[PDB]
PDB file of C-alpha atoms (C1' of nucleotides) in Angstrom:
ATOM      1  CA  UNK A   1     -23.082 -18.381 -23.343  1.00 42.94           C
ATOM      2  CA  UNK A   2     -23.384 -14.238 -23.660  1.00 39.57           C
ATOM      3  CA  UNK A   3     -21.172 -12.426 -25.538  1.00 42.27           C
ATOM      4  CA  UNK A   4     -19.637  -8.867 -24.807  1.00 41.33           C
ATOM      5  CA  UNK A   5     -20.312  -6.240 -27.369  1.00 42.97           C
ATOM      6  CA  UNK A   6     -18.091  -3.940 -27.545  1.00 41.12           C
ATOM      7  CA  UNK A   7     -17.665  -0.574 -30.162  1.00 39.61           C
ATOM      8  CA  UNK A   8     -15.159   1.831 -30.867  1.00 40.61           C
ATOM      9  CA  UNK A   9     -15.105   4.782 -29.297  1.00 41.40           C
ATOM     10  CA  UNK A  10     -16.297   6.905 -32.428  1.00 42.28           C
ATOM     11  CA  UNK A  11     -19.454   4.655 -32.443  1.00 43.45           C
ATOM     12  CA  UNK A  12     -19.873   5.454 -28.353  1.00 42.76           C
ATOM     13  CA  UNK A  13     -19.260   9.393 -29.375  1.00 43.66           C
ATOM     14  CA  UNK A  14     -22.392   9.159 -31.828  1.00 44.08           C
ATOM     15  CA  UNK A  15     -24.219   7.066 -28.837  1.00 43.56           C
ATOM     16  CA  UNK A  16     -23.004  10.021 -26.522  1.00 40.91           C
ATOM     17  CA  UNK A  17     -24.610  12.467 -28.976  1.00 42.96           C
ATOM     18  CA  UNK A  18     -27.735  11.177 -29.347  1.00 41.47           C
ATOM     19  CA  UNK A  19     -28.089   9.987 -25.910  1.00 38.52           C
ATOM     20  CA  UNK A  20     -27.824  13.821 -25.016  1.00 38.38           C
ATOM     21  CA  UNK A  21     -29.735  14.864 -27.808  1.00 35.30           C
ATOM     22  CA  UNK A  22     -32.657  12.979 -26.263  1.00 34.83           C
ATOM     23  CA  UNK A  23     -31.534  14.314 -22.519  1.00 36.35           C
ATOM     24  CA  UNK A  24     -32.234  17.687 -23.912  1.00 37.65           C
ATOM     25  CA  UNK A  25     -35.318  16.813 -25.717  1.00 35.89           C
ATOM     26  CA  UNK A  26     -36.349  15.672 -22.201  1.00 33.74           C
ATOM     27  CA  UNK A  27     -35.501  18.562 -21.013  1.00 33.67           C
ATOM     28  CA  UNK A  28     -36.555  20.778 -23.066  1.00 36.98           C
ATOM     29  CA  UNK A  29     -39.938  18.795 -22.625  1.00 36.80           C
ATOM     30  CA  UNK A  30     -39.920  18.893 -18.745  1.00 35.68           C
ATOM     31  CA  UNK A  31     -39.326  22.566 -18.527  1.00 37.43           C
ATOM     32  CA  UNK A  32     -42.143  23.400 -21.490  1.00 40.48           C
ATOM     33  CA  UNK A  33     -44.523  21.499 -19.841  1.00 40.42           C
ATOM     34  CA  UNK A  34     -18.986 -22.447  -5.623  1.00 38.14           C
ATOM     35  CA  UNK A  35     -21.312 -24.852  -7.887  1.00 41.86           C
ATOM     36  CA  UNK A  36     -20.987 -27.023 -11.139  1.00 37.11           C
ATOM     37  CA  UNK A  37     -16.813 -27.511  -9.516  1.00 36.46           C
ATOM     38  CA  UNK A  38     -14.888 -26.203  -6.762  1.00 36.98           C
ATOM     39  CA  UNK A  39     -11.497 -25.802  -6.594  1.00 38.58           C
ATOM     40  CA  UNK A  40      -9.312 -27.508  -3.563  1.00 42.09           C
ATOM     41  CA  UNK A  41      -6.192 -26.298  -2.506  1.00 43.88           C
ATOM     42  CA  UNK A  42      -3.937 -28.158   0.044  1.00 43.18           C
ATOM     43  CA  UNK A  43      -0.746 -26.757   0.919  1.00 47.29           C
ATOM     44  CA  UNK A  44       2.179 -27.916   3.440  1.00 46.55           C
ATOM     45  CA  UNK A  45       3.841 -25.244   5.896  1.00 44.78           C
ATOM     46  CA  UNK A  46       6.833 -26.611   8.301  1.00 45.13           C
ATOM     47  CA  UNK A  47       5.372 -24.490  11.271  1.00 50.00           C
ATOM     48  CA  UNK A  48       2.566 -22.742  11.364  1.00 53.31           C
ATOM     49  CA  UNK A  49       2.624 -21.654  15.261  1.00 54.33           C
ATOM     50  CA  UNK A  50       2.828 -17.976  14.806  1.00 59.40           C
ATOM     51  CA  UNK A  51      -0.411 -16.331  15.968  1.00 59.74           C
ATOM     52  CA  UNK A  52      -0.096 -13.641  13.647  1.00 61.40           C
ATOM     53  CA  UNK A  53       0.233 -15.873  10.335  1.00 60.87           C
ATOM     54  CA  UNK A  54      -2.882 -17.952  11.602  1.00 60.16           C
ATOM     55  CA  UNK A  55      -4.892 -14.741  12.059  1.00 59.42           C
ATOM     56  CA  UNK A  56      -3.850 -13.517   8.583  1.00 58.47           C
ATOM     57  CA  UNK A  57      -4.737 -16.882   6.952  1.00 57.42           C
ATOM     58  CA  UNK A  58      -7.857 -17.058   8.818  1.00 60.11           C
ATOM     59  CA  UNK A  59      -8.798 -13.699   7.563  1.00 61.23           C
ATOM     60  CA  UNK A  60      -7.899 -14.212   3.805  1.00 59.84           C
ATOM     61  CA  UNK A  61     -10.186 -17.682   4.403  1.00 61.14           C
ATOM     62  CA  UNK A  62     -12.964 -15.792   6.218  1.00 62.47           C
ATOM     63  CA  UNK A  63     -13.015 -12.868   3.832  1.00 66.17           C
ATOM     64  CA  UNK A  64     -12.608 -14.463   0.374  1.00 68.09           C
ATOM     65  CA  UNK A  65     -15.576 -17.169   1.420  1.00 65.04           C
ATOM     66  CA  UNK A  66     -13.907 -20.446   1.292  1.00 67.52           C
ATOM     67  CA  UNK A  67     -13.896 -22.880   3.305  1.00 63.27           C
ATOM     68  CA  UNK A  68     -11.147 -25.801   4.779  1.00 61.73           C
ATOM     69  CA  UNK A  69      -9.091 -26.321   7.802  1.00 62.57           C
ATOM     70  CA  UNK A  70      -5.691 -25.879   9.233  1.00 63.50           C
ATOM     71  CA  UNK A  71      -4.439 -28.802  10.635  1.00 65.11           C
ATOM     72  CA  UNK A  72      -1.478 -28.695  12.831  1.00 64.64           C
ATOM     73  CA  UNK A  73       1.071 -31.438  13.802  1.00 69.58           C
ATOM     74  CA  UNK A  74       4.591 -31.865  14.615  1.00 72.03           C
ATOM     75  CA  UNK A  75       6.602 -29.601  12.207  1.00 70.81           C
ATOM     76  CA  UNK A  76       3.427 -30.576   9.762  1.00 71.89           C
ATOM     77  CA  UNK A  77       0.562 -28.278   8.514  1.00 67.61           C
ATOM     78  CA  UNK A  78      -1.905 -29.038   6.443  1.00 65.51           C
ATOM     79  CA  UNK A  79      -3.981 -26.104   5.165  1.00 67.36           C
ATOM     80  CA  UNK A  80      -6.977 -27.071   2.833  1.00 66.41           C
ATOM     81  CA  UNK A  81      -8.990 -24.190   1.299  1.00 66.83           C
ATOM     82  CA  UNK A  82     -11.887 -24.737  -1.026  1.00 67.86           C
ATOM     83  CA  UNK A  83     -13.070 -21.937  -2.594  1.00 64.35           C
ATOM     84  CA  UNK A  84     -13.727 -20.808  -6.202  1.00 62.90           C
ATOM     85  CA  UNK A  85     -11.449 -20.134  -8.230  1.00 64.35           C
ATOM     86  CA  UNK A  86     -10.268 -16.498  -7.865  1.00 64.72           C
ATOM     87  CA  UNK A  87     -10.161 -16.899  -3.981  1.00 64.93           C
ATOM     88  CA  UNK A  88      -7.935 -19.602  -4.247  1.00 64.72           C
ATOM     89  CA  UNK A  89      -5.641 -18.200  -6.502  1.00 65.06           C
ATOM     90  CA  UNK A  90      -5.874 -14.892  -4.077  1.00 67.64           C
ATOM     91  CA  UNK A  91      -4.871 -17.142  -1.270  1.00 67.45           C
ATOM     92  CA  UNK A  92      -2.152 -18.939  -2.712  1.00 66.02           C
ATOM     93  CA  UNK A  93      -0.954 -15.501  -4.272  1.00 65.38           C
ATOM     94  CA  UNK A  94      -1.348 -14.535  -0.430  1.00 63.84           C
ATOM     95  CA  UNK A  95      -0.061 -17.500   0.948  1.00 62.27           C
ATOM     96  CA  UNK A  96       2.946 -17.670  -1.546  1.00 63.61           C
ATOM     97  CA  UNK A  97       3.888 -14.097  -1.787  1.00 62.28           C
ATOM     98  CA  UNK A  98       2.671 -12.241   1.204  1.00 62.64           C
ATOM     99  CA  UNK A  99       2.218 -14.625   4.316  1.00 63.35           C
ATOM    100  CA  UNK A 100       6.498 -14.385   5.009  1.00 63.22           C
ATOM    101  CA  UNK A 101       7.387 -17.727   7.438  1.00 60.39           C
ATOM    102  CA  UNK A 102      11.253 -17.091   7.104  1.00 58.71           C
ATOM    103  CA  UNK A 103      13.818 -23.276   8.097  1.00 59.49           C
ATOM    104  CA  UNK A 104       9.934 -22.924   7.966  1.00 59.97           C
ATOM    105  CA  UNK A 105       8.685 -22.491   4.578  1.00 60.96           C
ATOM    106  CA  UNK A 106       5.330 -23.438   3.035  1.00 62.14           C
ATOM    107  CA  UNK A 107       4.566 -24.755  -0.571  1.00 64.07           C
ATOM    108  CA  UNK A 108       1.292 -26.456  -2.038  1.00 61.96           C
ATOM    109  CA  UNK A 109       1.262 -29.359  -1.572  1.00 64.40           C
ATOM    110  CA  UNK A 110      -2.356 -30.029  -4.388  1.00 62.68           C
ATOM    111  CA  UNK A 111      -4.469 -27.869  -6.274  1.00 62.97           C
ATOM    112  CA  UNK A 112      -7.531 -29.414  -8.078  1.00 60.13           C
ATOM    113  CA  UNK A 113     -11.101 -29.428  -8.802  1.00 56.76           C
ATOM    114  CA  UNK A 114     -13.665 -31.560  -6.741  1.00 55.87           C
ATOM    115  CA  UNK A 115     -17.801 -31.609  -7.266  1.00 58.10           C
ATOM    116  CA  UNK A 116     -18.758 -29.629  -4.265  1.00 59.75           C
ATOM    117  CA  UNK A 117     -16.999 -28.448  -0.405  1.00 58.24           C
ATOM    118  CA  UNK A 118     -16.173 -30.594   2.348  1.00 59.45           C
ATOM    119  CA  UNK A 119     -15.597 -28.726   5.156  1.00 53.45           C
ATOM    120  CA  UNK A 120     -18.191 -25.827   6.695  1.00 52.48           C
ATOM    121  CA  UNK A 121     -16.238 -23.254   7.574  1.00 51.79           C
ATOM    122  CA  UNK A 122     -12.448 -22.904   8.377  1.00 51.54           C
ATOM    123  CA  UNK A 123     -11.602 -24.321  11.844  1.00 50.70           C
ATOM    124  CA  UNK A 124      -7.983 -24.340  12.915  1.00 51.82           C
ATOM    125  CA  UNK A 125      -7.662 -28.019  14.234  1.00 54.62           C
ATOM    126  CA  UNK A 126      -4.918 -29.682  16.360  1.00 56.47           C
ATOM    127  CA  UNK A 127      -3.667 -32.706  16.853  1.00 56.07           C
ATOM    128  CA  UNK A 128      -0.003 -34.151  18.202  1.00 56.75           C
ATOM    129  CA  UNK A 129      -0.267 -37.022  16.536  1.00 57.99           C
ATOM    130  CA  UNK A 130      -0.719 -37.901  12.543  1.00 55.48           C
ATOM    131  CA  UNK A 131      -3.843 -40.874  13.620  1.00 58.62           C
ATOM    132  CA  UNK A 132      -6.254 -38.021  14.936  1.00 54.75           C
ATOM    133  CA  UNK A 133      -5.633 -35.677  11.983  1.00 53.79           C
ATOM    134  CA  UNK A 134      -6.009 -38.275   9.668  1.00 52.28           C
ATOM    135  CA  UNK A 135      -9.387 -39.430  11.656  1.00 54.56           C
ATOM    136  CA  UNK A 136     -10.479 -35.569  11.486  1.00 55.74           C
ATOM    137  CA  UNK A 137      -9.536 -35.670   7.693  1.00 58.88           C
ATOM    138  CA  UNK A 138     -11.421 -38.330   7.090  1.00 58.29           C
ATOM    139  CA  UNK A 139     -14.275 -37.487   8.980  1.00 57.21           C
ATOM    140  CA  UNK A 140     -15.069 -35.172   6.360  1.00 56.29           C
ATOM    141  CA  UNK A 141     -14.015 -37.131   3.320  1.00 55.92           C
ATOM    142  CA  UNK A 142     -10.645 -35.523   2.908  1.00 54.66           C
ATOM    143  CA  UNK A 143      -8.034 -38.380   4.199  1.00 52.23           C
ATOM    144  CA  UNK A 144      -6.366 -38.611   1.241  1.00 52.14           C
ATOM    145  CA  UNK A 145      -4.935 -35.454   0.974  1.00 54.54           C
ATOM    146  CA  UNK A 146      -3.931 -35.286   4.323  1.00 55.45           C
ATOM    147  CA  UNK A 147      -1.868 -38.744   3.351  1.00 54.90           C
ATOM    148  CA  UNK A 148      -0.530 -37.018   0.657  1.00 53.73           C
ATOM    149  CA  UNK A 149       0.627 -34.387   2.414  1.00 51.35           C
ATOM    150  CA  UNK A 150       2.165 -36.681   4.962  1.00 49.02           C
ATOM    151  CA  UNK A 151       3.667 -38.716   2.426  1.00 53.82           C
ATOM    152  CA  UNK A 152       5.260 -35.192   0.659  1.00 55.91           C
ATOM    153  CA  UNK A 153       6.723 -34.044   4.067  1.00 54.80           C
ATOM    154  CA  UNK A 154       8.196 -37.511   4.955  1.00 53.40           C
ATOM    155  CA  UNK A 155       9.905 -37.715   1.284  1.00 54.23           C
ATOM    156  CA  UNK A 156      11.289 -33.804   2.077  1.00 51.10           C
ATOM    157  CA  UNK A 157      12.263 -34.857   5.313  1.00 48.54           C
ATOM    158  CA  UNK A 158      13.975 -38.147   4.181  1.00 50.09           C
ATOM    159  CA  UNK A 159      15.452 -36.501   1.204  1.00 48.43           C
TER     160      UNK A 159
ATOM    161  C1'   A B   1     -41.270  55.456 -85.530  1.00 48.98           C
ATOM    162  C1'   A B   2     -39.062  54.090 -81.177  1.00 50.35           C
ATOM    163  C1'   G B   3     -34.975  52.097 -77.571  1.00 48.94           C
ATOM    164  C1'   G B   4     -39.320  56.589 -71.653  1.00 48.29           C
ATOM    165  C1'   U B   5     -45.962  51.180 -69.351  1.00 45.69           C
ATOM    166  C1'   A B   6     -43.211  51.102 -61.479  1.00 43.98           C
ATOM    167  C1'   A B   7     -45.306  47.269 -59.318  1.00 42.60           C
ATOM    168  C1'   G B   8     -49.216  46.005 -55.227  1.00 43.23           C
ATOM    169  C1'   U B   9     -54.308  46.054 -53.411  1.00 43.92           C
ATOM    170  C1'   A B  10     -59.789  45.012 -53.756  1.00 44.73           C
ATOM    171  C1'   U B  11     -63.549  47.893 -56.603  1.00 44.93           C
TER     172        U B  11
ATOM    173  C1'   U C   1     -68.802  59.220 -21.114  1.00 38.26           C
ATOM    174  C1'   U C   2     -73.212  59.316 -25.081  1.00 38.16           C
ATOM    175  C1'   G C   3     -73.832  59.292 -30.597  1.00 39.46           C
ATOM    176  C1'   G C   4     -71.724  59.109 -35.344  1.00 33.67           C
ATOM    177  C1'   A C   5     -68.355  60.470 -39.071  1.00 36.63           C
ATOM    178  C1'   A C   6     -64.692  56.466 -40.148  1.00 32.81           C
ATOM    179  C1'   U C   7     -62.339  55.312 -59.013  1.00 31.98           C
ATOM    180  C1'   A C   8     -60.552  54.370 -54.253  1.00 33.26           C
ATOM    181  C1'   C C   9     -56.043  52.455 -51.525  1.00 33.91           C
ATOM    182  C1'   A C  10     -51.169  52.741 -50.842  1.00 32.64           C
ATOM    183  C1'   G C  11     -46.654  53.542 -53.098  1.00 31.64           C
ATOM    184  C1'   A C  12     -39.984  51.455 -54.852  1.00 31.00           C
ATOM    185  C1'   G C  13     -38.467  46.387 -49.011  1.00 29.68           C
ATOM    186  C1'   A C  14     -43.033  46.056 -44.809  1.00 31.74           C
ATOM    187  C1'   A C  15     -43.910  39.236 -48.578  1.00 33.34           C
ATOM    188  C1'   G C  16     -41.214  42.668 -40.394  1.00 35.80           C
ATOM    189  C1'   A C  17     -35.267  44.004 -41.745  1.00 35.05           C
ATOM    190  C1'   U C  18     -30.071  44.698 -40.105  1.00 34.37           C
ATOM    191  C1'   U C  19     -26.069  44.032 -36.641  1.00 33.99           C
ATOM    192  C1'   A C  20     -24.232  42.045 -31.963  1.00 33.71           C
ATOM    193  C1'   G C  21     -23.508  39.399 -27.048  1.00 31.47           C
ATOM    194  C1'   C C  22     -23.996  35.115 -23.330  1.00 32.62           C
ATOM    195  C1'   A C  23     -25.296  29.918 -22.303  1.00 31.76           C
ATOM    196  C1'   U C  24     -25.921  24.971 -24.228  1.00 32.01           C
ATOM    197  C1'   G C  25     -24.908  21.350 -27.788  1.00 29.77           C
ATOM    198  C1'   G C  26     -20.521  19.112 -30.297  1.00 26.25           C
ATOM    199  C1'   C C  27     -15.336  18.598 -29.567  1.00 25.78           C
ATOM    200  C1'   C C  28     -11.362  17.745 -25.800  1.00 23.25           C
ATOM    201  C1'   C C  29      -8.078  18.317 -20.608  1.00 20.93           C
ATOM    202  C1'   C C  30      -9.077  17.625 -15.633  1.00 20.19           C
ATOM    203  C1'   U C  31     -12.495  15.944 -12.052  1.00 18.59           C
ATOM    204  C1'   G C  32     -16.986  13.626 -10.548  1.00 19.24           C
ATOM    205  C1'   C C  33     -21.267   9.962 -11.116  1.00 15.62           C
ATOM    206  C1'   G C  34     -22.816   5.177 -12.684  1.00 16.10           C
ATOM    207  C1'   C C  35     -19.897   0.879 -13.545  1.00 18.61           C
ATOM    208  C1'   A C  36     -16.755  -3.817 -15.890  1.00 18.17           C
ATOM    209  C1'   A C  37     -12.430  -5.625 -13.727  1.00 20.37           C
ATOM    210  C1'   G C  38      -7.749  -7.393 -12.108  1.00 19.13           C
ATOM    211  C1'   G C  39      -3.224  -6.202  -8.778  1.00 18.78           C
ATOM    212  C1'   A C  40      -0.835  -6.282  -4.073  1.00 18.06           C
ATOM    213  C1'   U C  41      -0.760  -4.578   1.465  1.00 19.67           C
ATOM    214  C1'   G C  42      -2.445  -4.541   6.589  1.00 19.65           C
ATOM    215  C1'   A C  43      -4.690  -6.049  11.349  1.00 16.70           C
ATOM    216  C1'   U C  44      -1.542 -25.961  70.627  1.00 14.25           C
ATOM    217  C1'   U C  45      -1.444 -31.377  68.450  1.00 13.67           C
ATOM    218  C1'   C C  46      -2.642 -35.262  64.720  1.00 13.90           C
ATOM    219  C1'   G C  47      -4.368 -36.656  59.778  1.00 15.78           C
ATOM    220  C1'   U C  48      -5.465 -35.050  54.066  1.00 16.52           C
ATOM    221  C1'   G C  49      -5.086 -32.129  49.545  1.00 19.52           C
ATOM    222  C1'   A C  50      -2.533 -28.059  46.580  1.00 20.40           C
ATOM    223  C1'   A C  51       2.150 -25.021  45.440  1.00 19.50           C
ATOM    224  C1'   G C  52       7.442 -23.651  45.586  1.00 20.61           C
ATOM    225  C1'   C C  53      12.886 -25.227  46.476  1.00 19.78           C
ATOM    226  C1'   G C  54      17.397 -28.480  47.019  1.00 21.61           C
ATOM    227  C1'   A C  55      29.105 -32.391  56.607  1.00 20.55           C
ATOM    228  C1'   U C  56      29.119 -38.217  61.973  1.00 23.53           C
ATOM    229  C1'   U C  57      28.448 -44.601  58.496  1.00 18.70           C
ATOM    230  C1'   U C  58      31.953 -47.658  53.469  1.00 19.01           C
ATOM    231  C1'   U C  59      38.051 -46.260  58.324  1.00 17.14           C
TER     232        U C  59
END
RNA sequence: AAGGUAAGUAU
RNA sequence: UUGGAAUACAGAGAAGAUUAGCAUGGCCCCUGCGCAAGGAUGAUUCGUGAAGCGAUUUU
């Protein structure tokens, strides 16, 4: 809705003048006298076990304020982040460029907008099989990225 | 003839 | 400390001058304050339970 107004800096250097013009006069006076859209990343790392790499994602999720969850399966992880929009694109930045796995690499799997968050806070769940992740996914609404996910590392792993 | 009144200040 | 004295006046600038220094302002380098903002990095016996280990008879 609001504008910026900006001037040149010869305009500012008049501003400048005055302003100190009236400093003096002073002076001289004193001495006489996440809403409306978040968005929902999901991306898809072939192992996640390092300690390290978990602690470092968990601290780019704790200290840009988004929330999610790290789910963990066999040579599967799902890592959700919802966040606004900077923060996400600060943790996939991170998570692209920074967070170094390397036959483990991670890629995003989605990236979109939903209405509001999901998850609380960022809990680093576990589960052998893909039935309790998905259960855990869609205890809090989010099954169908988790599917998707699935889906993308079964068509990599078939392909 | 002249071209040679200092001004100022209140009485 | 008393009391009073206090044409004339003044007159070529006095209708108070001349010269000079420092700071500030402004300008701009650096730095600081306030502040918009993105970028990437890093963290003695029996019974039961538990644990360890691994050549007489198929002539």
């Amino acid at each position: 809705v609001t504008l910026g107004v900006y001037l040149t800096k010869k305009e500012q250097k008049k501003l400048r003048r005055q302003t100190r013009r009236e400093a003096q006069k002073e002076l001289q006076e004193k001495v006489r006298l996440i809403s409306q859209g978040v968005h929902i990343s999901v991306y898809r790392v072939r192992n996640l076990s390092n300690p390290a790499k978990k602690f470092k994602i968990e601290a780019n999720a704790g200290q840009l304020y988004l929330t999610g969850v790290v789910v963990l399966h066999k040579d599967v992880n799902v890592v959700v982040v919802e966040g606004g929009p900077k923060a996400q694109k600060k943790f996939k930045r991170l998570m692209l460029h920074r967070i170094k796995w390397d036959t483990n690499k991670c890629v995003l799997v989605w990236e979109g907008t939903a209405k509001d968050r999901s998850f609380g806070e960022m809990k680093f769940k576990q589960c052998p099989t893909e039935n309790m992740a998905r259960e855990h996914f869609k205890k809090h609404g989010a099954e169908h990225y988790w599917d998707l996910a699935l889906s993308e590392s079964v068509l990599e792993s078939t392909d």
